[PDB]
Amino acid sequence: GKCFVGGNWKCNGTKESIVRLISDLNSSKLEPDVDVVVAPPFLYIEQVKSTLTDRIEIAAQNCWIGKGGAFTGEISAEQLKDIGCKWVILGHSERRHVMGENNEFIGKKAAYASSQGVGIIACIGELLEEREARKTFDVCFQQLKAFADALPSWENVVIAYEPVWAIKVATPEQAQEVHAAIRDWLNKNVSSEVASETRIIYGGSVNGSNCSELAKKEDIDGFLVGGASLKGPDFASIVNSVA
Amino acid sequence: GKCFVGGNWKCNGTKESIVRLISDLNSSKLEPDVDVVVAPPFLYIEQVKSTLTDRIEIAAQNCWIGKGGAFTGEISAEQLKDIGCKWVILGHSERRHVMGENNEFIGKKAAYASSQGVGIIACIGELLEEREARKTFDVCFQQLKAFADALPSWENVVIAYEPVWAIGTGKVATPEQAQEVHAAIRDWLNKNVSSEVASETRIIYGGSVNGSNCSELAKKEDIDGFLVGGASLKGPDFASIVNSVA
Numbered sequence A: 001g002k003c004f005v006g007g008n009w010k011c012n013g014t015k016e017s018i019v020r021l022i023s024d025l026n027s028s029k030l031e032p033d034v035d036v037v038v039a040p041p042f043l044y045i046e047q048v049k050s051t052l053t054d055r056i057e058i059a060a061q062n063c064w065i066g067k068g069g070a071f072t073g074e075i076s077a078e079q080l081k082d083i084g085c086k087w088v089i090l091g092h093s094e095r096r097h098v099m100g101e102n103n104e105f106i107g108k109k110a111a112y113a114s115s116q117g118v119g120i121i122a123c124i125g126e127l128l129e130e131r132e133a134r135k136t137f138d139v140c141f142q143q144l145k146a147f148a149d150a151l152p153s154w155e156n157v158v159i160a161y162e163p164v165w166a167i168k169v170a171t172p173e174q175a176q177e178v179h180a181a182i183r184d185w186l187n188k189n190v191s192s193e194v195a196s197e198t199r200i201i202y203g204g205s206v207n208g209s210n211c212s213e214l215a216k217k218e219d220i221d222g223f224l225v226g227g228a229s230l231k232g233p234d235f236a237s238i239v240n241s242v243a
Numbered sequence B: 001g002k003c004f005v006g007g008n009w010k011c012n013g014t015k016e017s018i019v020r021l022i023s024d025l026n027s028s029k030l031e032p033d034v035d036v037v038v039a040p041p042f043l044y045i046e047q048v049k050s051t052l053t054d055r056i057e058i059a060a061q062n063c064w065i066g067k068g069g070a071f072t073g074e075i076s077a078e079q080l081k082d083i084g085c086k087w088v089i090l091g092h093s094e095r096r097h098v099m100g101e102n103n104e105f106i107g108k109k110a111a112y113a114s115s116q117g118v119g120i121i122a123c124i125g126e127l128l129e130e131r132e133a134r135k136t137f138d139v140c141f142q143q144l145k146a147f148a149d150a151l152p153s154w155e156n157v158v159i160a161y162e163p164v165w166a167i168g169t170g171k172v173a174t175p176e177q178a179q180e181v182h183a184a185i186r187d188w189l190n191k192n193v194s195s196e197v198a199s200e201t202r203i204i205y206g207g208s209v210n211g212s213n214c215s216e217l218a219k220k221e222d223i224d225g226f227l228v229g230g231a232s233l234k235g236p237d238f239a240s241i242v243n244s245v246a
Helices: A015-027 A044-050 A077-083 A091-098 A103-115 A127-130 A136-150 A172-189 A192-197 A211-215 A232-241 B015-027 B043-050 B077-083 B093-098 B103-116 B128-132 B136-150 B175-192 B195-200 B214-218 B237-245
Strands: A003-008 A036-037 A056-062 A085-089 A117-126 A157-161 A200-202 A222-225 B004-008 B034-039 B056-059 B088-091 B121-126 B157-161 B203-207 B225-228
Touching: A003 A085, A003 A157, A003 A200, A015 A044, A015 A232, A036 A085, A036 A232, A044 A056, A044 A077, A044 B043, A056 B004, A077 A103, A077 B043, A085 A103, A103 A117, A103 A136, A103 A232, A117 A136, A127 A136, A136 A157, A136 A172, A157 A172, A172 A192, A172 A200, A172 A211, A222 A232, B004 B088, B004 B157, B004 B203, B004 B237, B015 B043, B015 B157, B015 B237, B034 B088, B043 B056, B043 B077, B077 B103, B088 B103, B103 B121, B103 B136, B128 B136, B136 B157, B136 B175, B157 B175, B175 B195, B175 B203, B175 B214, B203 B214, B214 B225, B214 B237, B225 B237
Parallel strands: A003 A036, A003 A222, A036 A056, A056 A085, A085 A117, A117 A157, A157 A200, A200 A222, B004 B034, B004 B225, B034 B056, B056 B088, B088 B121, B121 B157, B157 B203, B203 B225
Antiparallel strands: none
16 A cells, blocks of 8 residues: 555646646655645646656546536546546535535545546545534544445545644644544445555645654545645655655 | 627537547638637647637636635636636526526626636526516526626627527527527617627527527527537537528
């Protein structure tokens, strides 16, 4: 098994800014035993695939619930396959909470994307109001079950825990607390082999100056990086922290 | 005062299929003095921009309500401007009725994309039940109002009337029915915005347009062109639709 670091560029970047980011990612020294993924906005995925080192695999940030057709504005998983993505981010907190995506909806995307041979970065996490109600685990478990009930296999799936409730700062102990509970849930509700093989990555706010103490935690297998992924040096330091 | 014909490819296409569609579009002869636009899925916009005749301008099919940032999965209007789009489709019936976009949400996108210098294809239209209740105009007028209240300028705005019962159903509106609504839209613009906006703004018909039925629709006084769904995926068919509006 290998640790996993994904860079979610979110809704950011231009042709010019992405040339510079690709330049700095290409010149980075990245340790070889980490799986590295970046997720550009749809428009720029071809430019990234063409000029970024093939040591880094490419993810998209979303897809539609089913095959293509009369869904203006949407991108299908078979199109993600066609353009060269190996991964798609599903259930990101911003799509759940700004954009209203519910669990059944996200579950349909996971079933369909995996059916097209695209890996899933499956995002889960609870709001501040839910943690306060002592429902951290109820919410994360309900979200995991929706992925589990839809997926044909866990082989090409990574789980990202997003402490949405922080937005204070989550401690490495609070992060590890959830990652352990997630891995336990897999053990009890899927299998022992899935529980040990599935990477569980931390998706709270992470940069090159706070990743090292999170990386030491037993059930933190890497990171889903937000804003720090827009800068080569910061991102490379996060990659190298889990090597 | 030019007619306007847009092709909405929707969620369709691969590199390979789009090569074939681009080849067919490049090989057609398009009558001059028609604004022609195609809307590829986000992934393929660069490939289209690079290899499709620059006679045809490029649209995107959606964008976010405001500037970029922490909006995973979304494309901002300044990114559309960066990549070479001159138009974005907003308020398409599929985003309203399948994906839940409401009038105010759509209006925010329209205002923001306009602020980035991207043209608007503003879609309105009524459901089968609403036409059955004789609310066609109520609904269309409310949808126009939401665009008019949000838009800080009507430069580079085109209105697309899509009778939702006609999208992908093969039940095209008759030329008489379409003309009736287009006339009402233009009168609404005359009364509620300005007579300059009313006479200048292209009002295009969407809903099962194909190479057969475009000629009689194009004859109507207030139908200024088309927003083409399924037929835009076939190069020769789309070219005959462009050529109908001369």
